[PDB]
């Protein structure tokens, strides 16, 4: 590409909406697995 | 034009050759005119 070339992405807003949705649900799955560690640890901590 | 755009000139070498010809002759014409002024400005003054 000579010098800097401008390029345009297809459906950037729709892709951002689904990107946020996947990230948020994955973050929930992280929390729902940390609590299971807490429930398992208190059994072996107390 | 977006960012910087590359453009290409038509016949750059041939135009350079004719540019050198015209500049050189104009420079010679300047000297031929200066000497005539020098000759006319040593007799009268
Ligand atoms: C009354 C008396 C008047 C006297 C006036 C004298 C004028 C003399 C004219 C000479 C012209 C050549 C000098 C300027 C051109 C410089 C570029 C040059 O040599 O080009 C190379 C091939 O040129 C060539 O092969 C050009 C050959 C020209 C042959 C002479 C014309 C008759 C390519 O070299 P590059 O890749 O750097 O070229 C970059 C340009 N696009």
Which chain B residues have a beta carbon less than 8 Å from that of A4? 3-4
Q: Which one-letter DSSP state was computed for residue B8?
A: -
Q: In whole angstroms, what is the distance from residue B18 CA to residue B25 CA?
A: 11
Please report the resolution in angstroms.
Answer: 2.3
Experimental method: cryo-EM
Integer angstrom CA distances of residue B30 from B22, B24, B26, B27, B36? 12, 10, 6, 5, 10
Find tokens 């200066």 and name the residue.
B34
Which chain B residues have a beta carbon less than 8 Å from that of A3? 3-6
Q: In whole angstroms, what is the distance from residue B29 CA to residue B16 CA?
A: 20
In this structure, what are the phi and psi dihedrals at residue A5, rounded to the nearest 5 degrees?
-115, 135
Could you list the beta-strand ranges (E) of chain B: none
| Cβ–Cβ < 8 Å for A3, B2 | no
For the CA atoms of B36, B37, B40, B43, what is the dihedral angle to 10 degrees? -110
Nearest CA to CA, how far is A8 from chain B (Å)? 13
């Amino acid at each position: 590409c000579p010098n800097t070339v401008d390029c345009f992405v297809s459906r950037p807003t729709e892709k951002t909406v689904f990107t946020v949705f996947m990230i948020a649900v994955s973050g929930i799955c992280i929390l729902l697995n940390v609590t299971e560690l807490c429930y398992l640890l208190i059994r072996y901590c107390s």
